[PDB]
Amino acid sequence: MKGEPKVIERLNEALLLELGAVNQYWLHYRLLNDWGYTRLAKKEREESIEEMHHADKLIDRIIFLEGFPNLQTVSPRIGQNVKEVLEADLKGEYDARASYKESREICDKLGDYVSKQLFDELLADEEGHIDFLETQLDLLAKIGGERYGQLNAAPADE
Amino acid sequence: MKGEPKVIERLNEALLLELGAVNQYWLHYRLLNDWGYTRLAKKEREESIEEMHHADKLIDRIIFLEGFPNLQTVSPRIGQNVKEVLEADLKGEYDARASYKESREICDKLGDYVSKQLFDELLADEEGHIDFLETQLDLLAKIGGERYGQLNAAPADE
Amino acid sequence: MKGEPKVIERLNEALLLELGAVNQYWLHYRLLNDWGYTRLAKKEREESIEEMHHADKLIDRIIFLEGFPNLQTVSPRIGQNVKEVLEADLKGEYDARASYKESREICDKLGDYVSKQLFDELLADEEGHIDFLETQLDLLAKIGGERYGQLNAAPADE
Amino acid sequence: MKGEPKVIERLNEALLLELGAVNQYWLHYRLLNDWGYTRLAKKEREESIEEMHHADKLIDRIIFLEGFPNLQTVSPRIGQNVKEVLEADLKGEYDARASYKESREICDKLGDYVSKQLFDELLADEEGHIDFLETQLDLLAKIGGERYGQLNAAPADE
Amino acid sequence: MKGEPKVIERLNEALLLELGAVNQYWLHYRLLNDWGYTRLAKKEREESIEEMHHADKLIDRIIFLEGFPNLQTVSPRIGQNVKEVLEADLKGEYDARASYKESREICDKLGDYVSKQLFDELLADEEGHIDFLETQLDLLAKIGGERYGQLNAAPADE
Amino acid sequence: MKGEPKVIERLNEALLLELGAVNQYWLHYRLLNDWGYTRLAKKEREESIEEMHHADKLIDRIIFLEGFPNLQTVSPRIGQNVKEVLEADLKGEYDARASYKESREICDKLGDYVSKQLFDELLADEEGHIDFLETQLDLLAKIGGERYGQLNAAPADE
Amino acid sequence: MKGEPKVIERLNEALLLELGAVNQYWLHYRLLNDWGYTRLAKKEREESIEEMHHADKLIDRIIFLEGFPNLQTVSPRIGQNVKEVLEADLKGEYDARASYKESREICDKLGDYVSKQLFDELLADEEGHIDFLETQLDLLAKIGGERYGQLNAAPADE
Ligand code: HEM
Ligand code: HEM
Ligand code: HEM
Ligand SMILES: [Cl-]
Ligand SMILES: [Cl-]
Ligand SMILES: [Cl-]
Ligand SMILES: [Cl-]
Ligand SMILES: [Cl-]
Ligand SMILES: [Cl-]
Ligand SMILES: [Cl-]
Ligand SMILES: [Cl-]
Ligand SMILES: [Cl-]
Ligand SMILES: [Cl-]
Ligand SMILES: [Cl-]
Ligand SMILES: [Cl-]
Ligand SMILES: [Cl-]
Ligand SMILES: [Cl-]
Numbered sequence A, B, C, D, E, F, G: 001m002k003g004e005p006k007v008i009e010r011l012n013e014a015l016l017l018e019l020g021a022v023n024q025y026w027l028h029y030r031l032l033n034d035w036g037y038t039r040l041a042k043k044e045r046e047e048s049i050e051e052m053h054h055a056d057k058l059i060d061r062i063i064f065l066e067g068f069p070n071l072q073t074v075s076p077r078i079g080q081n082v083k084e085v086l087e088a089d090l091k092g093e094y095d096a097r098a099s100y101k102e103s104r105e106i107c108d109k110l111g112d113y114v115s116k117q118l119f120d121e122l123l124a125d126e127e128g129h130i131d132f133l134e135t136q137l138d139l140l141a142k143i144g145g146e147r148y149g150q151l152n153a154a155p156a157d158e
């Protein structure tokens, strides 16, 4: 099903953002683990693997539409503390959300309703991630960064 | 354990090659699947996930040595048939093998024997992948590309 | 919920296409089985039963909207070999996809968003079938029709 | 039970042939595996281990008769393709069969009926191996060497 | 296998460091337990038992090389708080790491590659312990010593 | 419960003897194993681990009494045969028994009845070890050292 | 991966030693069994099968490096009693150890670190066998050859 070039371009823009998030969440997993925040690190690892599945679905759609998937990554936000790490994740999610809103509208306008549906599902997922991250940052604000870190660290015998 | 800058540079060069292989094997998985070679596609997916673990171990070592892991990827070899896909994988493995031979020698010379051991394990893994890919290309040569593809395709009801 | 006549007409047009596909996939199942291509035959049988479920959902929606479901079938594409059978299936899927794109737009324009959603789900399903059939025809092209048939035949003791 | 020197000599001649077959089947296992013919390779490995048991039984009989078992091997037939590998195996089996026919007659003439029985069992085993190998070479002749190789190769994900 | 005197001396130097660590980790287990930091205490006990296994492997190698294992301990670092306890452990690990780097090089130079391999395995283990302890001290720095202690204490009913 | 200095001194004297026995029994385990007396070696290993538990209980009591446990070891008796190994163990047990008899009397005189009870339990344990070792040496005397060694060695396939 | 001729030569020298040990341990198994030393015989059989696995790994590496594995055996040390059998095994292990030390150094010098690693693993294995055999010969020396034989014989009803 030879796809619209403009739809393939939007799918490739999403792929770049998703691969960027895979890399950023994985680096955050390893960084948080080295800092001792092993519980939050595990959540970042789980979120990275979810973004990997998103990237896979975009690659599949691009190939189905007879486009060329461009697997590349623009490297950084890398914080120096747990608040900055969460804020960097959140910035990325807002950026993706804005991209996918524009993309679903382009796909609708061009009559590719199945690609539209893919962007709608990504959009719902990103708002879920935003909801989660905003809550974590609200908790950090309320209890303080040191108790937030303690809450998200394991004792030494685990 | 603040590491030698030259060792961290070699670890980052390996990370770039490993991330490149993750991307290339994943694209090959999706491409082969779309062509109908579902059994070889599954093997490529399994090899991509192995390279992901390698990348993870390099990121961990870099952070332990107080370096900055550079997660970026130089994008392509993408073949148009199953022989070219296998040859592109094989080129990548030879390139990595040469890199890791040089890197283990640098780590030894600088007295970082644990980083040396990491490169030695990567080197053994790459020679295993080379062994596998050379055998697949030898089989393809012997039985022909069409029977090799048939062997590596599933029937329609699977 | 007395429905728009134009929506009921689009639902009945879909029902005709779905019932046509039920019949065509079932005939293909029996024809391929008689030719010895028992594995592909089983896939065609499975696809026929899926189209039966689609037809059922269209009948249910038509009755809910107080329309009369018209269960009739315009009889044929019946190939003489496995490539022609697959191509006939594929033509039917492209025809259905075009119908459902137009229908979802009509339902949206008339404010029947639940009927729109039914057509959107049918559209996604048809693109899935197109993806599958295009891959099978690509495999057949690459390995040849005789190896494709062999791959999709069972030995005599099964 | 101090044995006839001529019987011990025949048992040692058999031991040399059996050890030669152990080595040849094992080399064929590794060679076929490297070529990608993993299913035939497994059969060769199984046949090598059977010849190992034969060698063990000959060593045991030689020691019981108070002789000295001579464990040595005259090294090669090593083919360059699957037909030549099978033909080399078959030549070895015909050579062993002829040896064991002569040996059972010598043991009978000298009144060592239990050693005769050992050669009779080896002879039956060798005719079984000949039956198998002749059938494989007949199949290879009928379907061609490339389909025979394909039949005896595994897909990449196994 | 009568060993090089210089290798046996290096093995005995390692044994002294390992036995020192057994004693220091065990004292830390009992001290931390008395302070109420029962979770960190358990980790120290587990680390002491690991060092016991290391000491055992060194004794075995020394005896194999026909040397005399010298089981003695130079007694202390004993902190007055949890930060000082962790820092004392870490000092010991850095001291051992430096010893084992020098020792593996001596064994290599003298051609005792199996003793070299033992020191390489100890070296990898010590860098693992360093990684762990540096992370714990980083967490303590980030959340404060009182929350770090609380995290590593059990409630009264456990 | 700030303890009597004289009681803490007696507890530290016991700790030194117990740690000495840990080391001596462990060296005997490894030495006997290298000589081939694997069954007696296992018993020595089990006895070493029991002395480790004794040392742990002394460390705990010393800390409870607000003393400083002194973990150090005066290194040797190391025999050249199985009789000398057993005699060295036995000498150590008699030395400990005499120490603990004096210590329980000091603790009683000073009114530390719980420390007295600890020494009473150690004393009973040591008389048990003496009973065992005297019986082993009596058996060795009666059947001879070579049969005693044979009895306490495993066959080669274990 | 076309290998260095000098590395392939070292691998073939190892293969000859390993195949020699397979044969010698198997003959020792059968000889010891005929003498009644069934427990030691079983250990020799187990050691022969381990050497078979070593030979297999060398054949695999040689083929990977595009060399020709030479499966041949220089026939003998065959003792007349259990002490001589053990001493013959031990001589063979010392000979192999010396070969593998030289070979790992050659592979390192030529930059074949994976072949180096294979020789390092063989070297560790051989020192393990030396450790075992030296202990058995020490036990035999201490308890006498007749009790050593008795220890390694089964009663008649087993
Ligand atoms: C093109 C980029 C990538 C794709 C398409 C991708 C895809 C996937 C998928 C689909 C899985 C699920 C595995 C399963 O079925 O359980 C997975 C797992 C995983 N990914 Fe990736 N990924 C990508 C990049 C990365 C990167 C850059 C890393 C860096 C370390 C990584 C690390 C992992 C790990 C550790 C797993 C766990 C697999 C296991 O548990 O064995 N991935 N990936
Ligand atoms: C302060 C000195 C020591 C203390 C307090 C101590 C304490 C202990 C304790 C309580 C255990 C029981 C482990 C369990 O819960 O199963 C143990 C086990 C053990 N000990 Fe020690 N020990 C000491 C010295 C040594 C030494 C010098 C060695 C020399 C090799 C050693 C070797 C072992 C071994 C091998 C184990 C077995 C643990 C396992 O199976 O994983 N110990 N020790
Ligand atoms: C005197 C020559 C030989 C004798 C008497 C012999 C005997 C045997 C026997 C009786 C077994 C059966 C093991 C079992 O009980 O499952 C066996 C297994 C085996 N043999 Fe040999 N063999 C000989 C030569 C070789 C050679 C030259 C190789 C080359 C690689 C080899 C490779 C193997 C392997 C890999 C096994 C499998 C054992 C396992 O799965 O752990 N053998 N051999
Ligand atoms: Cl799709
Ligand atoms: Cl932080
Ligand atoms: Cl590490
Ligand atoms: Cl192709
Ligand atoms: Cl409905
Ligand atoms: Cl056909
Ligand atoms: Cl017999
Ligand atoms: Cl071939
Ligand atoms: Cl074919
Ligand atoms: Cl060792
Ligand atoms: Cl504290
Ligand atoms: Cl107490
Ligand atoms: Cl003795
Ligand atoms: Cl290899």
Ligand SMILES: [Cl-]
Residues within 6 Å of the ligand: G080, G081, G082, G083, G149
């Ligand atoms: Cl004997």
Ligand SMILES: [Fe+2]
Residues within 6 Å of the ligand: A046, A050
């Ligand atoms: Fe989740």
Ligand SMILES: [Fe+2]
Residues within 6 Å of the ligand: A046, A047, A050
């Ligand atoms: Fe999640």
Ligand SMILES: [Fe+2]
Residues within 6 Å of the ligand: A047, A050
């Ligand atoms: Fe999620």
Ligand SMILES: [Fe+2]
Residues within 6 Å of the ligand: A018, A021, A051, A054, A096, A126
């Ligand atoms: Fe995403």
Ligand SMILES: [Fe+2]
Residues within 6 Å of the ligand: A021, A051, A093, A096, A125, A126, A129
């Ligand atoms: Fe996201």
Ligand SMILES: [Fe+2]
Residues within 6 Å of the ligand: B046, B050
């Ligand atoms: Fe794998």
Ligand SMILES: [Fe+2]
Residues within 6 Å of the ligand: B046, B047, B050
């Ligand atoms: Fe793999």
Ligand SMILES: [Fe+2]
Residues within 6 Å of the ligand: B047, B050
């Ligand atoms: Fe792999």
Ligand SMILES: [Fe+2]
Residues within 6 Å of the ligand: B018, B021, B051, B054, B096, B126
């Ligand atoms: Fe890799």
Ligand SMILES: [Fe+2]
Residues within 6 Å of the ligand: B021, B051, B093, B096, B125, B126, B129
């Ligand atoms: Fe690789």
Ligand SMILES: [Fe+2]
Residues within 6 Å of the ligand: C046, C050
């Ligand atoms: Fe289905």
Ligand SMILES: [Fe+2]
Residues within 6 Å of the ligand: C046, C047, C050
């Ligand atoms: Fe289906």
Ligand SMILES: [Fe+2]
Residues within 6 Å of the ligand: C047, C050
């Ligand atoms: Fe379907």
Ligand SMILES: [Fe+2]
Residues within 6 Å of the ligand: C018, C021, C051, C054, C096, C126
């Ligand atoms: Fe349909």
Ligand SMILES: [Fe+2]
Residues within 6 Å of the ligand: C021, C051, C093, C096, C125, C126, C129
């Ligand atoms: Fe359809």
